[PDB]
Write an enzyme that holds these catalytic residues in place. Structure first.
Site, PDB file in Angstrom:
ATOM      1  N   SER A 198      60.066 -23.050  59.603  1.00 59.91           N
ATOM      2  CA  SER A 198      59.413 -22.578  58.398  1.00 59.91           C
ATOM      3  C   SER A 198      58.504 -23.683  57.901  1.00 59.91           C
ATOM      4  CB  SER A 198      60.423 -22.206  57.322  1.00 59.91           C
ATOM      5  OG  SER A 198      59.759 -21.858  56.129  1.00 59.91           O
ATOM      6  N   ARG A 199      57.458 -23.308  57.173  1.00 55.20           N
ATOM      7  CA  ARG A 199      56.503 -24.310  56.724  1.00 55.20           C
ATOM      8  C   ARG A 199      56.842 -24.898  55.363  1.00 55.20           C
ATOM      9  NH1 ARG A 199      50.292 -22.565  58.579  1.00 55.20           N
ATOM     10  NH2 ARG A 199      50.746 -22.264  60.799  1.00 55.20           N
TER      11      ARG A 199
END
Ligand SMILES: Nc1ncnc2c1ncn2[C@@H]1O[C@H](COP(=O)(O)OP(=O)(O)OP(=O)(O)O)[C@@H](O)[C@H]1O
Lengths: 505, 58, 50
Positions: free
Chosen positions: A370-371
């Site tokens: 995930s960013r």
């Protein structure tokens, strides 16, 4: 009883509409073949306006011409006959929104298929709403506790963080978001609405039996009181499957614009792309890569852009999206997923071999990321999992390295043993979500090497054993993790003692 | 109960539960053999304790 | 409660085949004749609204 005839006769009174039935729309159908229909007339029709044919089937007028208008069907063409009368609604395609939608199971148009009577709708909302601009947004800062182990450990999710779940056929994909919804029972039983989080599942192009069993299962665990199911099954028309996720996105916008927090789950966008290229090829439009029209990137784009975290000026609503992409044989270089990867805020890859090894969930950590999830991870989990992804990538480095049978030093063999324990740790059965207070001590045991003396097969019973141990005894620490979401040094040392106690067995 | 508009049994099973609302009392039966177990416990324990408290200084 | 909802649905489908019976009652009438005047006075009411 006769009370259905009473309600239907009040609807017969509405059927008052005949006294003001001067429709400025009616026109003859020129032709109607291959999921499309050319209609003469309708000279005050609007663009992307809902119309309804004489055989009851509705349609969207998609392309306007001098001379005719091409209207797509919303069903089989077997009902529509040439030369008939095509009344327009007077509306761009809108769907019912409101709280009474919870529990119900509808079509792409909000018409319920559960057989539970009408819909208590709080309004009607357009399908192709603009996504909100950059100013009424906020960076995500609130967790989405999915209940899964490695998901909440490694890829945390913000309220509104657009996270892809990508995998292959029969690879445990649906069960992930399913158990996430089942974890949301914790706060949907609660009272704080900002703690609450509402669930919309969008089954498109799938088996009606599968959707029926899913709705059945959500009634068994009683997720239905906060659930909304949108069914666009494979028997139905391709434009319905095209249209339904936009409608559910409008529902999620209804919840988000009320300040509330809501979760939408797309399953799957892959068949929606199939339906859309089916439309475009029956629109005689030229395809591009892998026989898709080039706007299919714009399609899932303009879908998924309507999901974010509103700022406090908007009432701090949020809408989190879980798309599902079925790939072909673990490929991540087909045209459809590479588009979605360019849209979403991160990936959850499910390797087919791990589930083929029975490791459920079959998370490939090396691909899944995930960013901006780390900004909204639970603070205790953010404290206790800092070395965890590093150690798992480290174990992955010596994973393929140790296949040659060569003996190694105590450092790499230590990482090998502890990573085996962590790998066999993160398995989790279906319908078994875990609270954060439950997930913390397993991580704290896994980091500090206590699992190393335990047998590799013993880990599964050890998990439940140590959980029932703490729930019996260190229930105060569980409440501390629940209340704080953050471990102090005193909580850290008390946690250490409480672990090493049961680690002595 | 008012969910079922065709009630007909809910008073029956409700008064059946309220009938068996005194379910059954518990079992605090052991007060004679359990005290014999802890009697042997205190016996052998004080034997051990006196012996080790002697033999430490011895 | 499950059987209650089942009985409601059986009532609804028996009233659906009763709707078939009502349609067959409506089919053979000079309401076919009289109802033309219904449309007549009706369309008078609609077009005299404007
Ligand atoms: N944690 C788990 N516990 C038990 N069974 C699991 C678990 N994870 C996956 N499975 C099994 O994986 C199978 C596939 O589930 P699921 O439908 O989620 O996979 P999928 O890839 O989504 O398939 P589809 O895309 O066809 O729905 C199910 O039969 C389920 O029993």
């Amino acid at each position: 009883k006769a009370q259905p005839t009473e309600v239907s006769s009040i609807l017969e009174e509405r059927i008052g509409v005949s006294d003001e039935a001067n429709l400025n729309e009616t026109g003859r159908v020129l032709a109607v073949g291959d999921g499309i229909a050319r209609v003469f007339g309708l000279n005050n029709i609007q663009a992307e306006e809902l119309v309804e044919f004489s055989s009851g089937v509705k349609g969207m007028a998609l392309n306007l011409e001098p001379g005719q208008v091409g209207i797509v069907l919303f069903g089989s063409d077997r009902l529509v006959k040439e030369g008939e009368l095509v009344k327009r609604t007077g509306n761009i395609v809108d769907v019912p929104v409101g709280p009474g939608l919870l529990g119900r199971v509808v079509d792409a148009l909000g018409n319920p298929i559960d057989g539970k009577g009408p819909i208590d709708a709080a309004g009607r909302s357009r399908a192709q709403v603009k996504a909100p601009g950059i100013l009424p947004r906020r960076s995500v800062h609130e967790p989405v506790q999915t209940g899964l182990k490695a998901v909440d450990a490694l890829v945390p999710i913000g309220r509104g963080q657009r996270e892809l779940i990508i995998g292959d056929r029969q690879t445990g994909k649906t069960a992930v978001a399913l158990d996430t919804i089942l974890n949301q029972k914790r706060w949907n039983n609660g009272s704080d609405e900002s703690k609450k989080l509402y669930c919309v599942y969008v089954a498109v192009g799938q088996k009606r039996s599968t959707v029926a069993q899913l709705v059945q299962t959500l009634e068994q665990h009683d997720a239905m009181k906060y659930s909304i199911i949108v069914a666009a099954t494979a028997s139905e028309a391709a434009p319905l499957q095209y249209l339904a996720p936009f409608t559910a996105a409008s529902i999620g916008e209804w919840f988000r614009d009320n300040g509330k927090h809501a979760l939408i789950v797309y399953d799957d966008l892959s068949k929606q792309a199939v339906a859309y290229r089916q439309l475009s090829l029956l629109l005689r439009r030229p395809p591009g890569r892998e026989a898709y029209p080039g706007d299919v990137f714009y399609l899932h784009s303009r879908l998924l852009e309507r999901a974010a975290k509103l700022s406090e000026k908007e009432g701090s609503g949020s809408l989190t999206a879980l798309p599902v992409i079925e790939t072909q044989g673990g490929d991540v270089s087909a045209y459809i997923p590479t588009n979605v990867i360019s849209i979403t805020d991160g990936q959850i890859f499910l390797e087919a071999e791990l589930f083929y090894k029975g490791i459920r969930p079959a998370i490939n950590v090396g691909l899944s990321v995930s960013r901006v999830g780390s900004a909204a991870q639970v603070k205790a989990l953010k404290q206790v999992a800092g070395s965890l992804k590093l150690f798992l990538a480290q174990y992955r480095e010596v994973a393929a390295f140790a296949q040659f049978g060569s003996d190694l030093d105590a450092s790499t063999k230590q990482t090998l043993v502890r990573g085996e324990r962590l790998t066999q740790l993160l398995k989790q059965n279906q319908y078994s979500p875990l609270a954060t207070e439950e997930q913390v001590p397993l991580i704290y045991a896994g980091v500090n090497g206590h699992l190393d003396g335990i047998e590799l097969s013993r880990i599964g019973e050890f998990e439940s054993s140590f959980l029932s141990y703490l729930k019996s005894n260190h229930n105060e620490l569980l409440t501390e993790i629940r209340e704080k979401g953050e471990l102090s040094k005193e909580l850290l040392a008390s946690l250490k003692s409480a672990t090493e106690s049961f680690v002595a067995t | 109960r008012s969910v079922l508009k065709n009630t007909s049994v809910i008073d029956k099973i409700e008064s059946y539960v309220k009938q068996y609302k005194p379910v059954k009392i518990d079992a605090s039966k052991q007060l004679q053999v359990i005290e014999s177990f802890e009697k042997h416990a205190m016996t052998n324990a004080k034997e051990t304790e006196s012996l080790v408290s002697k033999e430490l200084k011895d | 409660v499950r059987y209650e909802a089942s009985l409601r649905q059986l009532e609804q489908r028996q009233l659906a085949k009763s709707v078939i019976s009502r349609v067959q009652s409506e089919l053979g009438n000079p309401k076919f004749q009289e109802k033309v005047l219904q449309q007549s006075i009706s369309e008078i009411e609609q077009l005299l609204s404007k």
